[PDB]
């Protein structure tokens, strides 16, 4: 045993080494030995963790996809369901397309959600309205099939109920709204954090009469936020802002805000540059600029644009793509995020249109499916907008300062150096820059010290970095010598009060006013 081989390795080492290879490689390795074949075709974990990276279910290899998904793979189930619904990759005749495609897509979507662990439900966004005006679109077919399955499922049906309820929530009908609310009630009956929080949000708008119900709501909010939700945490961070009515102490509210403000870590970095052949961040700047323009066209909120940029960054960090596909990535991410959170979405026929038909319907379908499958289903993540909102609902400040804070919060999207700081620190520094720009006597208040859990000395570097990377340096141009000004053009609207054209101070003035030297 001087030279040990792969032949005599134990089950754990073989399990781990075989879980990080693509499907083509795992098929190739299956030709080496009989014991390897027995291990692969006997133990379901190796198939369960196998990739299906850059493949898509064609009629030649439908059996492979079905076999891998049916025994513990999530990517295969997602791709199979999306291919069955969107009808790209499978040669299904138009006469029998509807029923068979709907049932297959619904079954595979249910399996994909069942195999998901530790994420908020997401499969409801592939079937959300608007639907076909005439006839029966496959989205409706899979919707009714999923409803029937939930009526007949036993293992894990709460996620299916939540997805169903989220589907009819976006329907403009009082009956549809009552069926939706009726849905998270049944989902909350079996236990679901997001469903319970949505139920609570549907009750805050209804009954605000006496402090007793406010205390009941505070109890439920504490229960939800303690478990680990995100929307619940953000909502609870403002019910503490309602400190006067709500029975509690100043120290408790300050502690809650400190906990939610010191529980963030910097995530993104130069990983994306070193994980591909090359990006040079100029292509990212171009893509984000174009996405900002498209969001300006169709009245898209700040939150959706931030989510789209974050999803783009996550996918780019996970699965590599060639240069000529970045715009496809951006359009697919905007479609997916707009479907997720917003109300008016970027429809697929429209989605391909802005790209000057450079790509096609099928390519966008494939990119959307693979983007969703590569993110494991986690779409909503901490973003600067949430902390900007929680900080501006605490300290009462003038409207121009609010608009400026929003403007510097949105300018972090283009630049990637601002990822070295957590969203909490960056949002606090943005509020600090908004206050100091208007020349208020006291930038940082004792209330802010007690709430944000940080002092001035914890915020000097972040303000300097934000101001430099936002206004200072120069704009990236190569031939046209014209700066990319979609964000500035987005913020020249009268709805924002023509904020973007007001002057701002220089880096030297900011350093002088903040007591920071230079060299």
């Amino acid at each position: 045993p001087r030279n040990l081989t792969i032949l005599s390795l134990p089950e754990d080492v073989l399990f781990h080494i075989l879980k990080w290879l693509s499907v083509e490689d795992i098929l190739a390795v299956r030709a080496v030995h009989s014991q390897l074949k027995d291990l692969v075709d006997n133990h379901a974990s190796v198939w369960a963790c196998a990739s299906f990276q850059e493949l898509w279910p064609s009629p030649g290899n439908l059996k492979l996809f079905e076999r891998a998904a049916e025994k513990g793979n999530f990517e295969a189930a997602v791709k199979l369901g999306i291919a069955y619904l969107y009808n790209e990759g499978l040669s299904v005749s138009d006469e029998a397309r509807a029923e068979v495609n709907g049932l297959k897509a619904s079954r595979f979507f249910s399996l994909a959600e069942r195999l998901n662990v530790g994420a908020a439900p997401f499969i409801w966004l592939f079937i959300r309205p608007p639907w076909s005006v005439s006839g029966s679109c496959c989205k409706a077919v899979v919707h009714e099939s999923l409803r029937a399955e939930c009526q007949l499922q036993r293992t894990h049906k709460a996620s299916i109920l939540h997805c169903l309820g989220r589907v009819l929530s976006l329907f403009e009908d009082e009956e549809k709204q009552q069926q939706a609310h009726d849905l998270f009630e049944e989902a909350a009956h079996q236990g679901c954090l997001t469903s319970s929080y949505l139920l609570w949000e549907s009750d805050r708008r209804t009954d605000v009469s006496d402090p007793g119900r406010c205390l009941h709501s505070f109890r439920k909010l504490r229960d939800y936020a303690a478990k680990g939700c995100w929307e619940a945490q953000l909502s609870l961070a403002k019910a503490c802002a309602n400190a006067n009515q709500l029975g509690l102490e100043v120290r408790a509210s300050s502690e809650i805000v400190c906990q939610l403000f010191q529980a963030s870590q910097a995530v993104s970095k130069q990983q994306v540059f070193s994980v591909q052949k090359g990006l040079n961040d100029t292509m990212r700047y171009i893509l984000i600029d174009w996405l900002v323009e498209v969001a300006t066209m169709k009245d898209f909120t700040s939150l959706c644009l931030h989510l789209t940029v974050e999803c783009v960054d996550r996918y780019l960090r996970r699965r590599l793509v060639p240069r000529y596909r970045l715009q496809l990535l951006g359009i697919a991410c905007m479609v997916i995020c707009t479907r997720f959170i917003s109300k008016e979405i970027l429809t697929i026929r429209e989605a391909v249109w802005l790209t000057d038909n450079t790509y096609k319907y099928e390519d966008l379908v494939r990119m959307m499916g693979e983007i969703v499958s590569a993110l494991e289903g986690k779409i909503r993540v901490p973003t600067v907008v949430d902390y900007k909102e929680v900080l501006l609902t605490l300290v009462p400040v003038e409207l121009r300062t609010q608009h400026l804070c929003s403007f510097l919060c949105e300018l972090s999207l283009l630049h990637t150096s601002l990822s070295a700081y957590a969203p909490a620190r960056l949002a606090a520094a943005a509020l600090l820059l908004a206050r100091l720009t208007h020349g208020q006597t006291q930038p940082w208040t004792t209330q802010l010290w007690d709430l944000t859990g940080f002092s001035y000395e914890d915020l000097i570097p972040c303000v300097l970095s934000l101001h430099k990377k936002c206004f200072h340096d120069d704009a990236p141009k190569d031939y046209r010598q014209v700066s990319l000004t979609a964000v500035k053009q987005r913020f020249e609207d009268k709805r924002y009060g023509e904020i973007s054209q007001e002057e701002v101070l220089s880096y030297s003035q900011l350093c002088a006013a903040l007591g920071v030297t230079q060299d």
């Binding site: 292509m283 171009i286 323009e293 000529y324 715009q327």
Partner: peptide, 13 residues
């Protein structure tokens, strides 16, 4: 720089 939204972005340096 610039053209309208409908475009094929020029990534090439």
């Amino acid at each position: 720089g610039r053209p309208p939204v409908k475009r094929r972005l020029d990534l090439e340096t």
